[PDB]
Design a binder for this molecule. Sequence first.
Ligand code: ATP
Ligand code: ADP
Ligand code: MG
Ligand code: MG
Lengths: 85, 460, 458, 55, 85, 85
Amino acid sequence: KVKATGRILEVPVGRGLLGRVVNTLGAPIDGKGPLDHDGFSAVEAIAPGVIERQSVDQPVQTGYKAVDSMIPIGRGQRELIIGDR
Amino acid sequence: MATGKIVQVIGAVVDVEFPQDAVPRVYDALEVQNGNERLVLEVQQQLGGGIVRTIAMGSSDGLRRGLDVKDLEHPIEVPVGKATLGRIMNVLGEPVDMKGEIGEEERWAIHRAAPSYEELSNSQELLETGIKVIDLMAPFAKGGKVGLFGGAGVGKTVNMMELIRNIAIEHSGYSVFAGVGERTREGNDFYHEMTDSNVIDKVSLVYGQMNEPPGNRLRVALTGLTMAEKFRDEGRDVLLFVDNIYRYTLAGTEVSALLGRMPSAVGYQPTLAEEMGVLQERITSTKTGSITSVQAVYVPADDLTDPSPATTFAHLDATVVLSRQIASLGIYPAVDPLDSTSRQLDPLVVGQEHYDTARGVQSILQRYQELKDIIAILGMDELSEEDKLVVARARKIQRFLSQPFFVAEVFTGSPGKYVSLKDTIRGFKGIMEGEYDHLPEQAFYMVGSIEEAVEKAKKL
Amino acid sequence: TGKIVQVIGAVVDVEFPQDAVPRVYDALEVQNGNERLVLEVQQQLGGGIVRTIAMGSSDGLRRGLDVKDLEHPIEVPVGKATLGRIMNVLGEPVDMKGEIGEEERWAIHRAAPSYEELSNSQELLETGIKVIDLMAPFAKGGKVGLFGGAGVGKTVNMMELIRNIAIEHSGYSVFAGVGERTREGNDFYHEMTDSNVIDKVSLVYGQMNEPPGNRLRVALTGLTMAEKFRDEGRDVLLFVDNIYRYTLAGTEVSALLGRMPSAVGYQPTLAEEMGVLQERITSTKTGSITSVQAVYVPADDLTDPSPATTFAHLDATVVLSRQIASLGIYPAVDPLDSTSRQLDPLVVGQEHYDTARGVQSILQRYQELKDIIAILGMDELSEEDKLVVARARKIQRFLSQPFFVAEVFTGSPGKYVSLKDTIRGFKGIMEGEYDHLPEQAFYMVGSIEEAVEKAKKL
Amino acid sequence: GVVENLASEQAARMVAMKAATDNGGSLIKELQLVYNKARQASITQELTEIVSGAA
Amino acid sequence: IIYDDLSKQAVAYRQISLLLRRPPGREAFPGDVFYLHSRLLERAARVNAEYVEAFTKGEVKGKTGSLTALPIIETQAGDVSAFVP
Amino acid sequence: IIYDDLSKQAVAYRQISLLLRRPPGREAFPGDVFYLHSRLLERAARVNAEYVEAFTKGEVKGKTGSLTALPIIETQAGDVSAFVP
Ligand SMILES: Nc1ncnc2c1ncn2[C@@H]1O[C@H](COP(=O)(O)OP(=O)(O)OP(=O)(O)O)[C@@H](O)[C@H]1O
Ligand SMILES: Nc1ncnc2c1ncn2[C@@H]1O[C@H](COP(=O)(O)OP(=O)(O)O)[C@@H](O)[C@H]1O
Ligand SMILES: [Mg+2]
Ligand SMILES: [Mg+2]
């Protein structure tokens, strides 16, 4: 028998996750005890619309001279790292 | 009253069963409550007894088998008219700018037939643009279709923002921007740019971004046309900018197999050419009014042979092929002068000096290309003197095609340049006639008119 | 209790009553003529039918036969009993000696160790092979992979590693022959038992003559013994003869199990099947499994989905190649694809790190020069370019070495080279100390000194 | 001595160009085999995927 | 946020899709592999201070939040023409 | 024993495998073409005297049998790197 809990997949979220190794379902695997989450959130949500955005003018520093001079990244950008193995 | 029930929900495709009388016809709309969310479905097939297979115009998540469906007996209908100017809308013509209701007077169905063969109107009223290479190699008339072909990152968007600046501000007529499958950031950046420049009062914007389910990306192009066609039927001259024709075809590919269709040559849908035709044959200038359109065309993998770019080449009056090589070499705009052309490049309709200059430029650059691998292996010393001459003039010509844009100033830190058509001819003819043979190559790079080439040459 | 309803090649469908249908990996038994056949359940279909894979020859089975439902997985002997002996995929003895006197049997479908249980050690291990511990040195407890096509030397190199790394390892070792030539097994068994080291090496052999059930589960009964020895606290060496054949048995079976084909024709579960196998083979905090695996690439195609999903699972990948072999340069190790996680100056030292990068920089530049030379010849090169072409050719010759296990095919006496000798040799060539010696002096020699002597007699 | 060295130069150039002609033919005959094998694989990867999709 | 291997996700989704018998596309990937990665990546964004203030019910004012993403892809032998790249 | 061509046995098996609608692999050969040749060729062997005594039930004693087998393969334009070779 299978019951249908009418709820979508939600994940522990908060500040207490900083420093924790966690599996996809939110179970800690580092073994350092339970989480301290600030409630749950849903895994599958929709993104902010056009009117809700703001343009990108703040840098995020790689620390690598080649990247940060020739291929700069800003706070909100979506940079792809591609190549071989 | 509600009249149908959902019987399948596989991914983005929803099947609805109705009584065998009054089954919804193809391209009709349907409505279902996805919880609190009103969800629209569009009918794509009448299959079997009483069943219709449909695409969700929204997320398919949260749907159950057995939900009630209500059939609206019309296609998706959108606001059209002046009330659409200055407003962002989605595929359904609902405001996404949070300024309130559209306030439309009239609403029009997005599925309509193209103009009849006797309605089409001939034109050769050449537009002038600031861009040297385009106005030399691919000038285009008012009422024509222009396509910008390129792979990823070659300058399609920067070119289209430049052309919007140069053409639309002189244009006194209303314009439509259709953001098919655009990046949401780029849509916001455009909206703010127009809002600051105060040209937002003559542009209507329809945006269907990448994140939206396939039906939105599929149908948003037709809402753009339906607005432009309303302005054309009022008799206006309209500017229609379409951000990617490719992601209309791709939005068709994603859903095609779930609609039961057998796959075609490169995994595309079997109906690729008809789907392209039915859309692109509406974008025409009739006797009542003219639509002028600029389309960007993504080129998957940078191969111009892929079915999708290959078919759309046959619909366009001018085709500006951008190339990744020229962009990688750092020459901007990355237009390939050998591949790009226009049907308005005729000695009869341009000035015959223009035509002669264009034929010269193309002949020279073609003659350089074949020499390239010879020099690379056997070396420059094993050219002859008249080839060493034509290889130099080729390099000078290939620098003088480059240009700074006002919208590509943020990237490079330099002012933007607008060159008049006459100055462009005068410069390229002078270079080919050798009046500037003694100047270095950098004296032509990233400059405006040839008078600016001699001023920078003096500084050099 | 159940009855056979379909026999499609290697897969067998059995119909059970509605209330006692076997679990997803249980084993069943049939009398196929005079012989007993074990079946392993793979899928529960509806109506009490299960699809099974036959662990033996499927010929002779008739529809309507009666199967017997055992209520446990395939369980194999483990430990000190399985230590001098050759065993089958079912864990039966395959040598003609008597029964295995085991105290315990483990099911072969187990779970990989948890994240907190793992252990990471940088304690570097030394091989006599010059190129392997120069270019891609591997440490104790990490997985080593020997790639390459057909005839490029995977097995001869592995027999060399078995010979040399057993010098500094005292504990037990497990050898798993997964779908390879039987003769190579028989030769290994007699070579081990003639050196009296058979009391430590434990052998499992499901070879390439066996049906696709036997070549699918033999790698897992290899690991189940290595995992028994790891959980006793021991450091274990695990050798796998070919770990392409485990994925090939899945490709042969997975059409008849009803799964739709994926890329090329691989099963859709290729990356999970490899991940379920190659994640239970690790060093935990209570043992350590040093493992060498030979990975056949099909058709010399390093972009094929079976090798390309194995490069992420290994610590030290050694890519053999056919062209280098055609030149006679055994071991035919391509130094521009072989790499390691342990090639870092913080673990391996700066002098070694700098030597290995110097070698890569030269041989890459030589590759760039080869296309110019091919059309024009060497005469149009710059004089610096001629200097690098001469040193790169000498370096390629010096990468070769004469193995003790290859003494039969060639006749040259074998050689073991220490790390300090090999870094001294390559450092000396790179800075041109040896610019005065002919190229053929460097071919098939051990330490640099030997090359000078060879040069004297040309 | 100069006139004789120029005659020697022309003989050495003709021998070099003859070698470069034969090596270019040798590359053409091998690149063509790579190309033919590639077109055949491309033709079999498709069709396999159209029959699998037709299902 | 760094997505380690959007390639191996694409491979996992392909496995799920085929086991469910959905119709295969090019290289056997389902067609909604573009929809998978696009709905994922367009979630990384910068949002204006009005959105932040609306979301936090007035608690935080005067701040634009941001999420930056660095997806990684592996190509085989540098082939960019493959489907997922 | 001299198998005069195993590359027209592989073809005559590919035909049977494609008439039975079995999914093809590389060069459209079936997935089990390797088993096809491995089962056949691994039957060529040298067997020890204990096996001959056990098989003949002691009527032959102290002799070792063998079956040498030299298969022929034809390859197109002389490359060894094809799948069946
Ligand atoms: N030093 C050497 N190293 C490797 N191979 C050598 C060497 N000297 C000669 N050879 C020849 O290379 C042959 C092939 O090597 P090997 O049997 O390891 O192939 P393989 O890598 O096992 O490939 P496969 O098992 O897939 O046929 C050896 O049988 C031998 O004839
Ligand atoms: N004319 C130009 N001047 C300076 N940079 C340019 C120019 N054209 C393109 N680029 C650079 O290349 C990028 C990619 O082109 P863009 O039009 O933004 O995307 P796409 O070409 O894919 O539509 C630009 O964002 C910019 O970084
Ligand atoms: Mg763009
Ligand atoms: Mg081998």
